[PDB]
Amino acid sequence: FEAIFGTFCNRLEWVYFLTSGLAAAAHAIKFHDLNKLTTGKMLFHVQVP
Amino acid sequence: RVASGAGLPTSRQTTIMVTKYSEKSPITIPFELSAACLTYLRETFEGTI
């Protein structure tokens, strides 16, 4: 005679980016056309006193 | 037909029933679509412009 007592489920720890301290170092941007982008560039022009 | 003379040999028959058969001639032409075309046609993206 076999009895199956119960089925239990593991409660995983859901973690999100913006809730973490590492998110402070990151400016978070959502931009759907990223698949098109090849290389995003920023260029500065400075004059020394 | 024309009514003939005294006893000249002329045709008896009216309404000959010759039969015609159809001649077949199929025509063919291909048109093509690419995988990218189908991807951007049906699997529309809720993304940007």
From Swiss-Prot, chain A:
Superkingdom, according to UniProt?
A: Viruses
Compartment(s): Virion; Host nucleus
Protein family: Belongs to the herpesviridae major capsid protein family.
Function recorded in the entry:
Self-assembles to form an icosahedral capsid with a T=16 symmetry, about 200 nm in diameter, and consisting of 150 hexons and 12 pentons (total of 162 capsomers). Hexons form the edges and faces of the capsid and are each composed of six MCP molecules. In contrast, one penton is found at each of the 12 vertices. Eleven of the pentons are MCP pentamers, while the last vertex is occupied by the portal complex.
State the oligomer form and interacting partners. Homomultimer. Makes the hexons and eleven out of twelve pentons. Interacts with triplex proteins 1/TRX1 and 2/TRX2; adjacent capsomers are linked together in groups of three by triplexes, heterotrimeric complexes composed of one molecule of TRX1 and two molecules of TRX2. Interacts with scaffold protein; this interaction allows efficient MCP transport to the host nucleus. Interacts with capsid vertex component 2/CVC2. Interacts with the small capsomere-interacting protein/SCP.
Stated name of the protein: Major capsid protein
Q: From which organism does this entry originate? A: Human cytomegalovirus (strain AD169) (HHV-5)
Residue window of the full protein shown: 50 to 98 of 1370
